[PDB]
Amino acid sequence: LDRFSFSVFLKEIRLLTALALPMLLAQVAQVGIGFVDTVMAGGAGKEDLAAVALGSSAFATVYITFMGIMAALNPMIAQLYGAGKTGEAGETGRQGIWFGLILGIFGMILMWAAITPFRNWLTLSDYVEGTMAQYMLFTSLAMPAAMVHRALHAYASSLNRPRLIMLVSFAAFVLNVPLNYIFVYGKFGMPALGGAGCGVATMAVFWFSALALWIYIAKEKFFRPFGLTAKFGKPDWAVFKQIWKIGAPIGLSYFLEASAFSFIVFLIAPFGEDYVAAQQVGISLSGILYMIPQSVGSAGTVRIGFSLGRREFSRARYISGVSLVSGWVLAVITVLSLVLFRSPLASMYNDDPAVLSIASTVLLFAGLFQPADFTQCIASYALRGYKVTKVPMFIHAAAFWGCGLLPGYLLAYRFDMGIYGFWTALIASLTIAAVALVWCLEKYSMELVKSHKAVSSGL
Amino acid sequence: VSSVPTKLEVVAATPTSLLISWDARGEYVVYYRITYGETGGNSPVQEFTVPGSSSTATISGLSPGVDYTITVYARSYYWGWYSPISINYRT
Ligand SMILES: CCNc1cc2oc3c/c(=[NH+]/CC)c(C)cc-3c(-c3ccccc3C(=O)OCC)c2cc1C
Numbered sequence: 001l002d003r004f005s006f007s008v009f010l011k012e013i014r015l016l017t018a019l020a021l022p023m024l025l026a027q028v029a030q031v032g033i034g035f036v037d038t039v040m041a042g043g044a045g046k047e048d049l050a051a052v053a054l055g056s057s058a059f060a061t062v063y064i065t066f067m068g069i070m071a072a073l074n075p076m077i078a079q080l081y082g083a084g085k086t087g088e089a090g091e092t093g094r095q096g097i098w099f100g101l102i103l104g105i106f107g108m109i110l111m112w113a114a115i116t117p118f119r120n121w122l123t124l125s126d127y128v129e130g131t132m133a134q135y136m137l138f139t140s141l142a143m144p145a146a147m148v149h150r151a152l153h154a155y156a157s158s159l160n161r162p163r164l165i166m167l168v169s170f171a172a173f174v175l176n177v178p179l180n181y182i183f184v185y186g187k188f189g190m191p192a193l194g195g196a197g198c199g200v201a202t203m204a205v206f207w208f209s210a211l212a213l214w215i216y217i218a219k220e221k222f223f224r225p226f227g228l229t230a231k232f233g234k235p236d237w238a239v240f241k242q243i244w245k246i247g248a249p250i251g252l253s254y255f256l257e258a259s260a261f262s263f264i265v266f267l268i269a270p271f272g273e274d275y276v277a278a279q280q281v282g283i284s285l286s287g288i289l290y291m292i293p294q295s296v297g298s299a300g301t302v303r304i305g306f307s308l309g310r311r312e313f314s315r316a317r318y319i320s321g322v323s324l325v326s327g328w329v330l331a332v333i334t335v336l337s338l339v340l341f342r343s344p345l346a347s348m349y350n351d352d353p354a355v356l357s358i359a360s361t362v363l364l365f366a367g368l369f370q371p372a373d374f375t376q377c378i379a380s381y382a383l384r385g386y387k388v389t390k391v392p393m394f395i396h397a398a399a400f401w402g403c404g405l406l407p408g409y410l411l412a413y414r415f416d417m418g419i420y421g422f423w424t425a426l427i428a429s430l431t432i433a434a435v436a437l438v439w440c441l442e443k444y445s446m447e448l449v450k451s452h453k454a455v456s457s458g459l
Numbered sequence: 460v461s462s463v464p465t466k467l468e469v470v471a472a473t474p475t476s477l478l479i480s481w482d483a484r485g486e487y488v489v490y491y492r493i494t495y496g497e498t499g500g501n502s503p504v505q506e507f508t509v510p511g512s513s514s515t516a517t518i519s520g521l522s523p524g525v526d527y528t529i530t531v532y533a534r535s536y537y538w539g540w541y542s543p544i545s546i547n548y549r550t
Contacts, residue, residue: 311468311480450471451470451471452468453468453469453470453471453546453548454466454467454468454469454481454546454548455467456467457463457465457466457467457482457544458462458463458465458467458542458544459462459465
C-alpha cells in the first residue's frame with residue numbers, strides 16, 4: 001500500500017569508485033559497428049533507388065532479435081569468472097558458438113524464407129516494390145547471420161576484462177568501407193551487383209570479424225575449446241538448453257523494440273506522413289546515442305553476474321545502483337541536448353532521407369520517454385544482466401508494448417498537438433519500468449541477504 | 460598456531476539440505492571435519508568430512524526449517540587443528 005519496491009536508495013556506502021568504465025569501450029566498439037551502416041546508407045547513394053535499408057533493416061530483425069539470445073550469455077560466462085575454467089566456462093563459449101551458428105543458421109535460413117516482401121496492404125515505401133535488387137541484400141547479406149552470431153558470441157565472451165573488440169570492430173568497419181563499394185561498382189572485384197552489393201560487402205565483413213574471434217586466442221590463456229561443439233546429455237544437452245531460458249526471455253523481449261518498430265512505423269500511416277515520418281531522423285537519433293547509454297548496463301551486466309561467481313553478494317548489486325545511476329547522470333545531462341538541440345545545418349540526407357523544412361515535434365519525446373527509459377532497460381541488463389532475471393523480464397516488456405498498445409491509437413485522436421501523444425503510456429507504460437524491474441533490484445539486491453548466508457567471517 | 464578456515468557462507472538450502480561454501484586456500488597438510496547439529500543443544504552432533512580446498516561442499520540436511528549451527532575444521536602440519544569457524548544459519 002506504499003513501498004513494495006522496498007528500501008530504495010541503498011546502493012550507496014563509498015562506491016564513488018565503481019570503475020565499470022571499460023564497460024564503455026564494450027559499447028564504443030558498438031558505435032564502431034553502428035556506423036558502417038551510414039557509410040552504406042550514404043555508400044549506396046551512388047545507386048539512387050538504392051534505398052537498400054529496405055532489407056538491411058528488415059534483416060537486422062533476426063539479427064538483433066536472435067542476437068538477444070546470444071549476448072544472453074553475458075552473465076553465463078562472466079559469472080563463471082568466479083569459477084575457474086574459462087574453457088568449461090568456455091565449453092559454454094564453445095557450446096554456444098555452436099548455437100551462434102546453429103541459431104546462426106536460422107537467421108541464415110528464416111532469412112531464406114524471409115524474401116517474400118512480394119506482399120501488400122498499406123502505404124508507399126512500406127509495401128510498394130518497383131525494382132527490387134533488395135532481392136540480394138536479402139540474401140547476399142542474409143546468407144551471413146550464420147558467421148555473424150559467432151561474431152557476437154565473441155563479445156558474448158568478452159565478459160571478463162576485454163574489449164579486443166574495440167580493436168577489431170573498428171578495423172572491421174574500416175575494412176568494409178573500401179570493400180563496401182568495390183561491390184556496388186568496383187575494381188578487379190565482382191564489380192557489378194551494387195544494390196545488395198553494399199551488403200555482400202557488409203556481410204563479407206561479418207565473416208572477417210567472425211575470425212577476429214578466432215584470432216584472439218592470442219593474448220593469453222585459452223578460450224579455445226572448439227573440440228567438437230556437440231551437445232547430447234539426456235534427450236537434448238543443456239549448457240545450451242541452459243542458454244535457452246536466458247535467450248527466449250531476451251529475444252522475445254528484444255521484441256520490445258521490435259514493435260517499437262510497428263508502432264513507430266505505423267504512425268507515419270494516417271495522413272500523418274510528412275514531419276511524422278521525420279520521427280526517424282528523430283528516433284533514429286534515439287537509437288544513435290541511446291546506444292552508448294543503455295548499453296553500459298548491457299556491459300555493466302558483467303560486473304554484476306561476474307561479482308556473483310566471485311561471491312561478492314551485492315558488493316556488486318550495490319554497485320548495480322552506482323552503475324544504474326552514473327550514466328543516469330548522463331541520462332539527464334544528455335536528455336538536455338535532445339529536447340534542446342536540433343538536427344541543424346550539418347544534417348544533409350543520410351541515415352533517413354529528410355532534413356530541411358520540418359518540425360521539432362520530434363524533440364517532444366526526446367524527453368518524454370528519454371531518461372525515463374534510458375536506464376529502464378539498463379536496470380534489465382543488470383537483472384537479467386545479473387541474474388536469471390529476464391525469466392519473465394520477458395513479461396517486463398509484455399507491458400512496454402501492451403500498455404502502450406492503446407496510446408498507440410492515442411496520438412491519432414489526440415488531445416494536444418500529440419505528435420508525442422501515443423508516446424503516452426509508451427512513456428508511462430515505459431516508466432512502469434522505473435518500477436517492474438528496479439523493483440526486482442530491491443526484491444533483488446534483497447536476495448543477497450537470503451543468499452549471503454554468512455554476514456562476515458573470522459580473521 | 461593461527462586463525463580459522465576464515466570464510467562464512469551457506470548461500471541457501473534445498474529447503475531440506477544445505478550448501479556450505481567456504482574458504483580453503485589450498486588445504487592444509489589437508490582436511491576438513493565439519494560439525495553437525497542444530498543450535499538446539501539436544502539433537503546430537505554428526506560429522507561430514509572432506510579433502511582439498513573443499514570446505515566448499517554440501518550437507519545431508521535432514522530435519523525441516525529448524526535452526527542448525529555447523530562449524531568447519533582446519534587440519535594441518537601437526538595432525539592437529541588449525542582452528543575452527545562457525546555460522547548457525549539454518550533452513
Ligand atoms: C541506426 C539505426 N538506423 C535505422 C535506420 C532506418 O532507416 C530507414 C529508412 C527508410 N527509408 C527508405 C526511403 C525506411 C522505409 C525504413 C528505415 C528503417 C526501418 C524500416 C522498416 C522497419 C523498421 C525500421 C526501423 O528499425 O526503425 C527504427 C527507427 C531503419 C531502421 C534503423 C534501425
